[PDB]
Amino acid sequence: ATGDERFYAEHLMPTLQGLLDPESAHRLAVRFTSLGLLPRARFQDSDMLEVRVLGHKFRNPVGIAAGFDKHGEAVDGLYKMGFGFVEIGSVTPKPQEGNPRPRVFRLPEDQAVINRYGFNSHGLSVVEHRLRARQQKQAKLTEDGLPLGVNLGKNKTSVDAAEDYAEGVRVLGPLADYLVVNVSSPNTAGLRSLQGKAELRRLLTKVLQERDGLRRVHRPAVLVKIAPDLTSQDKEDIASVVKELGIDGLIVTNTTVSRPAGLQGALRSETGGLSGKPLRDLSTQTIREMYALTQGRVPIIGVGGVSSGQDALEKIRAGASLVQLYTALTFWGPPVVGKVKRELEALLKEQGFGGVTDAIGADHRR
């Protein structure tokens, strides 16, 4: 509706993408966000958008997904952009470079991205100090309805995956409102095998024990982030383990290793995870499945191809309590956040929902 949305989407972003390679663009976006060089978002969040979940108030249900701010450099700039919550990461225990460049690719004709970053990470110690420098500022933000998530990965050469995640819980758990056990990156060999029943149960038991050993004020919720490429068996098993262990929530979904028929981008056959519009409905359907398998009792953060209020509401009605976006930001720029929120509010009113909370899982009750 606004002129700024139009200017960014039709002119500024496509022009700048024509000038800058994907990883240079990503780095500049992080820099510009971190320095607060963006104008403050003018959208005032209505009470209809507030969600209480995971032991926290969320001023609005639209978050920035993991992978944008991998190293916790731009958290305050992201809240300024109008995100209701920020997830940083993935962070690995030791610093690591990730894959050789180029490792990110735009598919403009599909409104999609393919990436194979491979968990490039400053490491736990660097991120720990970065978050400690603003820990009390974050405590106030959280109290004000603006929570922080930290997404944990594992190093390429580690000989004990569970210990990598445990180290992440110990080091960054005390600084996070929620932690994410990311077992769904398509870009680390053997990682997605940790989604299997026996491996997942053993990994999450260890993670939860570590979390429970933190002091009360420093004890985060623990969520598991899952792939969009799971078999029905895999999903049944994850739901079973989640309920057996009392895992606090799920993030649904990561990027897809599938390549849906109809992709037009020249770079469609690059190796990596596919994000954006072609992922959207695969993610929505995964949310729908996981909500049903967990009887609506396990909070879900829905992610994959959200670019509009309709996209957000579809995931909410399928069972998401909160949503995230990333790829839409890369195409449309900062005004997409306000756009999604304004559209979501309008649609909630049009469909007779009192607020976001009333719409969570609504399709299952039709």
Ligand SMILES: Cc1cc2nc3c(=O)[nH]c(=O)nc-3n(C[C@H](O)[C@H](O)[C@H](O)COP(=O)(O)O)c2cc1C
């Ligand atoms: C360039 C890029 C880097 C990403 N890095 C991470 C990561 O480090 N950890 C993670 O859990 N997900 C990562 N993701 C996945 C996103 O968090 C999200 O699950 C996925 O992109 C679907 O959302 P979208 O379609 O709105 O981008 C990344 C995605 C992209 C496009």
Ligand SMILES: CC(C)=CCC/C(C)=C/CC/C(C)=C/Cc1c(O)c(Cl)c(C)c(C=O)c1O
């Ligand atoms: C996305 C954002 C906060 C933009 C602010 C305006 C700026 C500084 C734009 C210039 C850089 C640019 C064209 C970024 C778009 C872009 C990209 O084109 C791609 Cl490919 C990626 C992977 C990312 C990751 O964040 C990305 O942001």
Ligand SMILES: O=C(O)c1cc(=O)[nH]c(=O)[nH]1
């Ligand atoms: O670092 C990456 O390559 C990465 C991690 C992840 O979880 N998802 C993704 O698409 N890329």
